[PDB]
Amino acid sequence: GEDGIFLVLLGLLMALVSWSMDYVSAKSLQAYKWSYAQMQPSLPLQFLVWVTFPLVLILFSALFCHLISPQAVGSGIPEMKTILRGVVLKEYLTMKAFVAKVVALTAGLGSGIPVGKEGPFVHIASICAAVLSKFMSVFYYSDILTVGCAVGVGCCFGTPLGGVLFSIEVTSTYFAVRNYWRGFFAATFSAFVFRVLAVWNKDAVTITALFRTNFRMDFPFDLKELPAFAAIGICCGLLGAVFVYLHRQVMLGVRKHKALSQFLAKHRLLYPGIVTFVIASFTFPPGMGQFMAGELMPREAISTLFDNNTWVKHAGDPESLGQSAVWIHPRVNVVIIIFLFFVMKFWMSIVATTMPIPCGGFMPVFVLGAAFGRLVGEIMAMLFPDGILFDDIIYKILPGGYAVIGAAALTGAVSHTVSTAVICFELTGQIAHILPMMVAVILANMVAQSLQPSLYDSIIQVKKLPYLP
Amino acid sequence: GEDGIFLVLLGLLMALVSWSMDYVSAKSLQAYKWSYAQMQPSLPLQFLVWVTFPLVLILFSALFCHLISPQAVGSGIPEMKTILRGVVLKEYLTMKAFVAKVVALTAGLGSGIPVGKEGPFVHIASICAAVLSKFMSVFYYSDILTVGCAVGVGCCFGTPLGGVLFSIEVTSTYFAVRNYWRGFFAATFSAFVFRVLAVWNKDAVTITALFRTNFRMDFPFDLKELPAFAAIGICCGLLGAVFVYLHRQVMLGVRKHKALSQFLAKHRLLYPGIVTFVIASFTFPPGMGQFMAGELMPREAISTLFDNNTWVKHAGDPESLGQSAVWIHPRVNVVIIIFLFFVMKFWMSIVATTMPIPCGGFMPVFVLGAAFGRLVGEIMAMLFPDGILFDDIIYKILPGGYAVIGAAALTGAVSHTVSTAVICFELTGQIAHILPMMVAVILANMVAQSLQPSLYDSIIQVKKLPYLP
């Protein structure tokens, strides 16, 4: 009927918005790197620019989520999964919030602070679905929200079927397969237009997925290492649980005492600002980024962590690798700097997503999972030096695969879902490690579902929304 | 709770059954090839053995679906998708049919006649689910059938998430996500045990998917060829529709007249037997297999059609390729033999799946799709000789990708579903062509949903089961 025209118009209007915002964010971020390099090597000057650019940009984003729309702070998927369980929120789906959010999500992304991308984008995709429906036939409600969620995540990442699985498996109890067909149609069209546009205007020469990895697909892994994958199941789930626990121990920590509540009511934007300050103090590269690999914005950080070469063995030479040359210090072994990167981005991510900013809880958790995966992969490669044999040719293990297993498993354990593995392999561009990441996702899910509740369940519990089951 | 023990026991019991039956079928089929080669080149003797082995084995399978269980003929998914819409069939889920079906599906598969594998396997997986539940807690119903369907197709092909999508998207109207989690768990465990067992006992050296393809993943296809994919959408959908139409024009063709009904009631097993005969008459390789590539059992036939080299250009030399050397005739161009293979397996497949045998409608449709795909790929490679340029290196197109697009799209158009692309790329082992196969699956679905009904809908219409919507 007249469903196809509405769905194709939603897809073509969502791809341009996603492409525009990350185009602008990428140009702002490379201008940041450019100016920071190109002034001079002056260590106080480097500190002051490396601090004053993210404070300006994050306080700008907090200003445009405070001023225009007072209801879009703390946004993302948990209040809309509260909405589709029956509760209506009338003023919350206003078009005026839309322009109030997108520009904030630009200025949440153009800095190197770990935030999400998915959550506010799911919200604005639902906004565009509702507005385009209300404009339609003036010249069904949970259907509109489910199609909005599918188009939102499948237009974030160019991952259609991971989009429709992410819409069904957490934001529902029953599900009409009419929405399955509609969400699959609109999500694959949005992911189609978003990827071909980066060949038209910019240069990404073909319809490569987003983050390709050149693994070898000829004996990737034997079953002599397979219980190691069991470890990267279980520990990730355990680590995922601790994340959720500590998240609540900051949320209530904002609201536990009258003193800091009076301090925040004295001036609202002071809480993001200074804490932006302190994580800039641990990201300055000659300050502590030597011990940290601090000079990595997160997109190229996880393009780096999915590399196809062993970092312990290429440390005997000063050979120029890609960006991964920042992962070599002349005094410290690389296992220690992966360890410190993991622990400091781990406590940095919770306090980064705590602040009153449009936040998603997917991307920094994905980065933490990749870091833990490559940690256990590098100690596997250090433990078994020779590799094993094949027809007069030697195959040695490679730790990019461990990184992609961990970057599926830990965010699957945090967000209490099994469909994270789908967008994981659909971002990485290869499915060589597919059933080990499914087994690891399921082990991490059963451990992190035994111990603690989900992330979004804790958010709706602390924010105290009407949530009946 | 006590769900995990039941699901892991179902998975480990289903993997052994699938592995055992295709182990036995593969050994029988290679013994067929072995004896046929190893007697002598005597052209009447070759004819008589090439005919008398499939007649014996197919009449044996028809005997063991006629004798023990009189209710398991015409089995597969459409009567069970009738069952889960409300209608009960009491005597149909008896354990006695289980042993009556599995051995038949061995002797439906050990011959080279095109049959399915999925349908009767979904049925026996539901049988094992129900029996293991009734044995459980003596020392929920649609849940048991949906878990049975997911384990069935994900244990056929080692494809978990394509399994759970194949269970939701056609055999439901609503869907409880409890069954999503259970089906995902049990399907990935079944696909895990099935693939690692082929390294323990037999040799498939690692957890390679099933049918790997070595494409190049470095500029697979430009967007200068992309409307060709539009053609392999639309035509496949049109061709898929014709398949369904002709299928009904044989089913009613059995039941249109009293004469052939009296002829069949005279002797029931005569109808499969002789028609097995006639397709053997068009598969004898010096008879007509020169013009046909007849000496290809279907599994190695579609391992051949997914090859990474151009068949027009490697015809100037008598170089030994793999099995694909059967695709070269010294007098006939290869486009004509792909064309004749397609048209003769097209009319052969409907009459092959017509006969009273446990049949699935997935595998021969998959083969027909691969043949049409490589047809349009070879004429694309014949049309554009030079390829195009890159950094002083030339990239020419390769027609394996067209074959895998067509083998997704035409069976997606026949079975009226979008989740065929998932098991397509999960069998082929690479996701380089993923969003073109999604776009082609959706174009073929909208054309073949405009023209004719589904395959299984026509089956339940002609068999006249109680089907309310």
GROMACS .gro file of C-alpha atoms in nm, chain A residues 158 160-161 164-165 168-170 172-178 180-181 184-186 188-189 191-193 195-196 199-200 205-209 212-223 226 390 416-419 421-422 425-426 428-432 434-436 438-439 441-442 446 449, chain B residues 158 160-161 164-165 168-170 172-178 180-181 184-186 188-189 191-193 195-196 199-200 205-209 212-223 226 390 416-419 421-422 425-426 428-432 434-436 438-439 441-442 446 449:
model
  140
  158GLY     CA    1   2.508   0.080   0.870
  160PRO     CA    2   2.038  -0.336   0.922
  161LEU     CA    3   1.961  -0.675   1.071
  164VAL     CA    4   1.594  -0.489   1.371
  165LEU     CA    5   1.722  -0.740   1.628
  168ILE     CA    6   1.285  -0.649   1.895
  169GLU     CA    7   1.481  -0.818   2.163
  170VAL     CA    8   1.492  -0.556   2.440
  172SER     CA    9   0.925  -0.547   2.356
  173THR     CA   10   0.749  -0.838   2.518
  174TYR     CA   11   0.540  -0.940   2.218
  175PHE     CA   12   0.622  -0.838   1.864
  176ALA     CA   13   0.416  -0.812   1.547
  177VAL     CA   14   0.603  -0.937   1.242
  178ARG     CA   15   0.451  -0.656   1.038
  180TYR     CA   16   0.971  -0.698   1.147
  181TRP     CA   17   0.916  -0.657   0.775
  184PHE     CA   18   1.395  -0.465   0.797
  185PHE     CA   19   1.293  -0.271   0.485
  186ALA     CA   20   1.355   0.074   0.629
  188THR     CA   21   1.840  -0.175   0.510
  189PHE     CA   22   1.746   0.122   0.297
  191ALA     CA   23   2.210   0.164   0.577
  192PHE     CA   24   2.226   0.153   0.199
  193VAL     CA   25   2.200   0.528   0.146
  195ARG     CA   26   2.718   0.392   0.294
  196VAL     CA   27   2.691   0.496  -0.070
  199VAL     CA   28   3.153   0.739  -0.193
  200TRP     CA   29   2.960   1.015  -0.369
  205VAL     CA   30   3.595   0.395  -0.215
  206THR     CA   31   3.317   0.129  -0.202
  207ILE     CA   32   3.041  -0.022   0.007
  208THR     CA   33   3.286  -0.155   0.264
  209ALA     CA   34   3.101  -0.193   0.590
  212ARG     CA   35   3.711  -0.347   0.784
  213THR     CA   36   3.965  -0.588   0.924
  214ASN     CA   37   4.209  -0.788   0.713
  215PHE     CA   38   4.218  -1.118   0.890
  216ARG     CA   39   4.345  -1.416   0.696
  217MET     CA   40   4.038  -1.654   0.679
  218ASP     CA   41   4.267  -1.955   0.627
  219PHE     CA   42   4.292  -2.134   0.962
  220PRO     CA   43   4.198  -1.838   1.186
  221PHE     CA   44   4.206  -2.034   1.512
  222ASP     CA   45   4.235  -2.395   1.619
  223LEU     CA   46   4.033  -2.557   1.893
  226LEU     CA   47   3.911  -2.249   2.261
  390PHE     CA   48   5.041  -2.670   0.849
  416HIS     CA   49   2.160  -0.767   2.862
  417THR     CA   50   2.114  -0.872   2.503
  418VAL     CA   51   2.237  -1.127   2.253
  419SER     CA   52   2.201  -0.914   1.941
  421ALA     CA   53   2.724  -0.982   1.839
  422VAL     CA   54   2.535  -0.910   1.517
  425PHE     CA   55   3.050  -0.863   1.322
  426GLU     CA   56   2.863  -0.633   1.090
  428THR     CA   57   3.405  -0.546   1.173
  429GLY     CA   58   3.327  -0.666   0.821
  430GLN     CA   59   3.418  -1.035   0.862
  431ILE     CA   60   3.243  -1.334   1.013
  432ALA     CA   61   3.541  -1.562   1.067
  434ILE     CA   62   3.111  -1.574   1.446
  435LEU     CA   63   3.013  -1.873   1.657
  436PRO     CA   64   3.286  -1.812   1.919
  438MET     CA   65   2.795  -1.605   1.991
  439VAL     CA   66   2.907  -1.852   2.258
  441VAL     CA   67   2.801  -1.339   2.423
  442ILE     CA   68   2.577  -1.605   2.573
  446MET     CA   69   2.408  -1.557   3.168
  449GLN     CA   70   2.209  -1.165   3.415
  627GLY     CA   71   2.523  -2.443   1.123
  629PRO     CA   72   2.213  -1.992   1.435
  630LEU     CA   73   2.072  -1.645   1.387
  633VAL     CA   74   1.596  -1.795   1.485
  634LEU     CA   75   1.496  -1.547   1.212
  637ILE     CA   76   1.008  -1.599   1.382
  638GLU     CA   77   0.936  -1.437   1.054
  639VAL     CA   78   0.713  -1.691   0.878
  641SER     CA   79   0.417  -1.661   1.368
  642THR     CA   80   0.200  -1.354   1.389
  643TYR     CA   81   0.305  -1.247   1.738
  644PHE     CA   82   0.622  -1.364   1.904
  645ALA     CA   83   0.734  -1.384   2.266
  646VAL     CA   84   1.097  -1.281   2.312
  647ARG     CA   85   1.138  -1.557   2.570
  649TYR     CA   86   1.386  -1.549   2.099
  650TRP     CA   87   1.635  -1.597   2.381
  653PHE     CA   88   1.909  -1.822   2.005
  654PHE     CA   89   2.072  -2.016   2.289
  655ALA     CA   90   1.977  -2.361   2.163
  657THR     CA   91   2.393  -2.151   1.856
  658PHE     CA   92   2.477  -2.447   2.076
  660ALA     CA   93   2.553  -2.514   1.542
  661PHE     CA   94   2.855  -2.515   1.771
  662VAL     CA   95   2.854  -2.888   1.838
  664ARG     CA   96   3.078  -2.786   1.340
  665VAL     CA   97   3.334  -2.897   1.597
  668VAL     CA   98   3.706  -3.176   1.329
  669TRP     CA   99   3.701  -3.443   1.600
  674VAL     CA  100   4.027  -2.866   0.991
  675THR     CA  101   3.859  -2.580   1.186
  676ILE     CA  102   3.532  -2.404   1.259
  677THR     CA  103   3.500  -2.282   0.902
  678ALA     CA  104   3.134  -2.221   0.835
  681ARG     CA  105   3.382  -2.106   0.236
  682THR     CA  106   3.452  -1.880  -0.058
  683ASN     CA  107   3.783  -1.705  -0.118
  684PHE     CA  108   3.675  -1.371  -0.251
  685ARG     CA  109   3.925  -1.089  -0.235
  686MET     CA  110   3.759  -0.830   0.002
  687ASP     CA  111   3.965  -0.548  -0.151
  688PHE     CA  112   3.735  -0.361  -0.392
  689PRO     CA  113   3.484  -0.644  -0.451
  690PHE     CA  114   3.251  -0.440  -0.672
  691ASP     CA  115   3.211  -0.078  -0.776
  692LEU     CA  116   2.883   0.106  -0.802
  695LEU     CA  117   2.502  -0.182  -0.931
  859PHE     CA  118   4.334   0.115  -0.915
  885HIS     CA  119   0.827  -1.517   0.088
  886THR     CA  120   1.081  -1.419   0.348
  887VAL     CA  121   1.368  -1.181   0.403
  888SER     CA  122   1.572  -1.399   0.638
  890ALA     CA  123   1.987  -1.373   0.299
  891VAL     CA  124   2.110  -1.439   0.652
  894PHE     CA  125   2.583  -1.529   0.382
  895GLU     CA  126   2.627  -1.751   0.683
  897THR     CA  127   2.902  -1.874   0.215
  898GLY     CA  128   3.132  -1.760   0.496
  899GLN     CA  129   3.183  -1.397   0.386
  900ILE     CA  130   2.976  -1.082   0.413
  901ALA     CA  131   3.139  -0.875   0.140
  903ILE     CA  132   2.575  -0.821   0.229
  904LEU     CA  133   2.370  -0.509   0.159
  905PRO     CA  134   2.338  -0.582  -0.215
  907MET     CA  135   1.957  -0.752   0.124
  908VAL     CA  136   1.839  -0.506  -0.143
  910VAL     CA  137   1.610  -1.005  -0.147
  911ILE     CA  138   1.370  -0.719  -0.080
  915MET     CA  139   0.803  -0.738  -0.328
  918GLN     CA  140   0.459  -1.108  -0.317
   0.00000   0.00000   0.00000
